[PDB]
DNA sequence: CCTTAAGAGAGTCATAGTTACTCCCGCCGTTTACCCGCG
DNA sequence: GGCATTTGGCTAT
RNA sequence: GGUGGACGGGCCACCCUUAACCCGGAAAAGGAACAUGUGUUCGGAAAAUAGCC
DNA sequence: CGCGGGTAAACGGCGGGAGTAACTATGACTCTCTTAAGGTAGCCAAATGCC
């Protein structure tokens, strides 16, 4: 507990006095091992865990908190905070105690009949309150009565009694045949030839099943025989302190081997602490569980009244599978996909047939037949954990059944998908698994609907329905019936039913510890490309009936009755009973189709308007199938599509700061090196925050806090001074930076063009519940905040740009044309803005423009494997002119300290002096220079050039010039002079080369005498002291005869050599100072 | 052999505008306990 | 066997 | 005063005998499991549909 | 005596003015820096194809 600001702060420790609070933190970290020192301001004792924060506070500290101002007369009942006015207390309760203000609103809403003032007692009472209705109904037909009533109630009078029994009175083409004709016609020609004998018995089916299997094996034992090619290359005390050193080296080994083997899964071992455990549940337990789960045919009684969205479009299936279609789908398939239960990966298929012809034949043979071979209807299931909790490592549901099918079945399934997906247009409400940003269009739709309901004072009921095991419960009969009801061609229906025939899998738990076959009789084949589409098609009836017969939230003349994303469903309503209607429809579907939903796993809420505001859950919880829902009260949240929705505030903006700090701690505690931690962060941590930080509509306050945490952590990992420019971290690795992501400049751009994407969408219903002007101005705001043109702001409600297709009559069909993506405008290139900011700095940007877009001068920043990190960090410091030279140390402080060279007596000890001018390092300089010459020498010799290393030439004035190199081959003299010059401007290396060429152009008839040649070329070979490769040097490298790949390799080698020889020069300079100070 | 000015970023603090309400007030028509005409 | 090219992440379900 | 704690800075143990540690720009197992003191293992275990950067 | 119509008198609804807590955005400031491995070297990224 330091007492910032202090001049010679004693440690809260043994007692040693350190010279600075920062040095005190260093002493605590190293000598003691405490990383949580808290700093209290000297004046007011304000405590902050961050040092300089308190340091900056101190000057503006307005003395110790004294004589607390008068306490308002409104005290909160939760935190005892005083407020000046009643409105203040109400707003505090709303903004800090939502569960309290909710109940306050509910209590205020309820009416009563108190009648506080003017309670005129009626001498009438119960005894007569009922007797008067009885007697007024007694003597009826007699008009002009009361002669008996007054006797009944003599206590009252005549006219008033008459007043009282008034008061109380007041209250087609046969796609099979089409395929046959198409084949026949194509086979009469020589177009298709691979399997001509196996196609004729298919036309008039004789042994079609065996034809499928025989063709399969006859062409698949080949691709199997080449899997072994891949398997061949994949074959790969004295003292007790030795034990601890072995453990530490083992942890190192592990992490550094994973880092270069697969940096992925190392990101996940570090972050989320999810280890490589293999499930130890007995194979009998897993066997029985998954047998009873999957080998249990569902109960799909029927689809009832539920219909589907439109009719089928069988034209998609008519035209055949062409090689370019397979190429498109293969390029659209995940590259590093694991193999099925035979080992055949995508690479096997590609190598066995680069220009897909055999596959393009077998796929057509399957499709024309409606059957698939009995060797691909198999898959290997794996149980991969969900969390590393031993008590939950002995839990069955801590594992997932990821099912891997034969890849040649996954590819055919994708090909069949494209066509089935086109032929069956899903309901526009199903935003999952469709070609669109479903998650964004659902999160925005919810957020909006809620905000608009609150603003317009309209009831809104939301239920986050939860189907249990939607993919593992949807019966195959259900899918077949759904396909039939859309009148999809019976041939494709039969093909789908056959793709769901006699499937079995084994759930491998450990290496070679497999279960045996479990016939998958229920559920969609997870891992099969068609399964998402089939699930959407079997779930469409629910959405159709909900949108046609349910009662949903209305904004105008339209009604979103049910949003959906895959199995996720959100029911909406405009009343507590309309939501009961939607829930009843959902129950009907779930009881008629076999899907199971329980209100225990479902949540919801009900926003009911009041005079001032709304109330949440001011009613009984809805019941789904009998068990009441888990109504989400204010202050609680529910995860919808990865974001926490709180009915009190819409989207719960939380977790990003805590998650980022936890991840930074996890990375810092890893046995990784300074530039490996930066890679793990910029490639596997910041991306994880994008989704939440984008779809949650985070502002530039949290974005700046997160970016500040990232910057501090990175600059501490890399041992860069805090004053180092942001550009080096945020500039692209192609421009000399580290490539770290600037969230404050990225997330606004992502949000702006996400809003653009939502506005420019196909969901017509979705773009009616959307607040047009609010998102228009929000898009303008984010565009300006992202650094865009404040005048040329695109109109999100007009059209996108992109386009740029193969517009001119492309022979590619619609199934072969590569899928076109949409490219909405970006506000700006924030990375280029960061680099421009770098270039504008005058001291840390010295000559940085030479690294504008150079991949051969920044090759080391990306590929730094075999370089001591102590060298890499110094290279980074040199590139930003933040190396602790006395010139840099006396920055801003200026006169405060001396900038003179510590070794020589030069005016400024700039980073350029140490590398280029100081006599002390002259030896090293010479070595480096000669070394570079030698490299060039060797390169020239590899092309059989004669070399005159440092020749002794003399002119008339006896002025001996010594051109570093002279290459000669076939009557030519390439005089070359190497020079490693610090780059302090865009035209620095050019100037050096010009100087060399001008100072050696005197010797023409002298070089002719020495070299025995007539073509006396003169070239300067400038190199950057910080690793800048002059582009014109390629000319020389071309004259030597180097290839265009060895040219780039040698350019990278030269840049690396120059940079890391300058680093060594700087290190020698500092080490000489170190070795001389002790004297 | 070579070069030859530089602060930059991190952090509070103050001021002004926004969002999502809070609060009350007046009016405005509406219920409720006798009044009047009353056949 | 020199040359030419290429080379990732995250989110929802 | 010197050695050892892989290496540097500490800080410890011993006086050739080594128990415990901290930080690092250093750290590729004298660590665990299966077989008889020696070899093997420590998995690159991860699918699909869309989206995003 | 019943039946119509009027009725102050608190009070349910709805516009309207004023009002504030907690953010959200912009700007003006003010604060920090002195530490501390040397090193064989041998540029290999590293993989994959291709001709
Ligand atoms: C998360 C996830 C889901 N899906 C699909 C398959 C899943 O069956 C479906 C969602 O299933 P869930 O609804 O998450 O399964 P469940 O929670 O109902 O199971 P439980 O009985 O334990 O309650 O979405 C994927 O294809 N990939 C994924 O990564
Ligand atoms: Mg579910
Ligand atoms: Zn200490
Ligand atoms: Zn203070
Ligand atoms: Zn409070
Ligand atoms: Zn000098």
Residue numbers in the entry: 1 to 171, 250 to 314, 327 to 1169
From the publication, what sentences describe this entry?
R2 retrotransposons are sequence-specific mobile elements that insert to the tandemly repeated 28S ribosomal RNA (rRNA) precursor gene locus (the rDNA) and are found within the genomes of multicellular animals including insects, crustaceans, and nonmammalian vertebrates. R2p inserts a cDNA for the mRNA transcribed from the R2 element by nicking one of the two DNA strands of the target site to create a primer for cDNA synthesis directly into the genome. Here, we report high-resolution cryo–electron microscopy structures of two vertebrate A-clade R2 proteins at the initiation of target-primed reverse transcription and after cDNA synthesis and second-strand nicking. The shared R2p core domains include the RT fingers and palm motifs (colored as RT domain) followed by the Thumb, a Linker, the C-terminal zinc-knuckle (ZnK), and the restriction-like endonuclease domain (RLE).
In this work, using cryo–electron microscopy (cryo-EM), we determine structures of an A-clade avian R2p that has optimal transgene insertion activity in human cell PRINT (R2p from the zebrafinch Taeniopygia guttata) as well as a newly isolated testudine (turtle) R2p that is in the Reptilia phylogenetic branch proximal to Aves. We therefore assembled TPRT complexes with PlaMe and TaGu proteins with either Gf-full or Gf-98 RNA. Within Gf-full or Gf-98, only the RNA 3′-terminal 65 nt before the base-paired RNA-primer duplex is visible in our cryo-EM density maps. In addition to the provided primer-template duplex, an added ddTTP was also resolved. A major difference between the PlaMe and TaGu proteins, in comparison to each other, is the disposition of the Spacer, the region that connects the N-terminal DNA binding domains to the NTE motifs. TaGu has a Spacer of ~80 amino acids that could not be resolved in our cryo-EM map, whereas PlaMe has a Spacer of only ~30 amino acids that we partially observe in our structure in contact with the RT core. While the entire PlaMe CTI could be mapped in the cryo-EM density, the density for the part of the TaGu CTI away from the RT domain and the active site RNA:DNA duplex is only visible in our unsharpened cryo-EM map displayed with a low density threshold. In a recent study, the TaGu CTI was inferred to be a disordered loop and, therefore, used as a location for insertion of accessory protein modules. In contrast, our R2p structure and the results from our functional assays recommend against CTI disruption in an avian A-clade R2p used for transgene insertion.
